[PDB]
Amino acid sequence: IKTAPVVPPTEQRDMVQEERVGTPVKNAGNANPAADSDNATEGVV
């Protein structure tokens, strides 16, 4: 048995951190966001 001094549970707080490597684009779920333009065969106002 080894009794060791630890940090009291009430003087620390677990905080969830979300780590990201880059900011997702506007049309993140779209494989081809350029197909709204390539399929505008009548024009756009």
């Binding site: 003087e11 707080r13 905080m15 951190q17 780590e19 990201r20 490597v21």
Partner: protein, 99 residues
């Protein structure tokens, strides 16, 4: 390297995390533990202790891809010259404009 056209950069950027903390308590833990190594109650130890307590990194352990990217790039560069002389593998030197 005449057709590469591809660049890789890494951002060692950080954020600020948490609210309601106590930075003096962590700063005490930091500079007390590393006391047989770096002298406590020092300007450098106080600075680094506060950045550790207040700031966190944004990429994290998921940003090690670039570090391993360039570690393999230099392994490939060295191991693909006909022989690793000083002639085949020059090292970037600080020239004075005149060479």
């Amino acid at each position: 390297g005449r057709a590469a056209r591809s660049t890789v950069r890494m951002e060692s950027r950080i954020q600020s995390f948490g609210e309601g903390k106590d930075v003096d308590n962590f700063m005490a833990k930091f500079h007390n533990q590393l006391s047989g190594v770096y002298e406590r109650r020092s300007e450098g130890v106080a600075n680094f202790g506060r950045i550790l307590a207040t700031d966190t990194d944004l990429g994290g352990t998921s940003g090690l891809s670039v570090v391993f990217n360039g570690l393999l790039r230099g392994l490939h560069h060295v191991s693909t010259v006909p022989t690793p002389n000083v002639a085949n593998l020059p090292i970037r030197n600080n020239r004075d404009g005149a060479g």
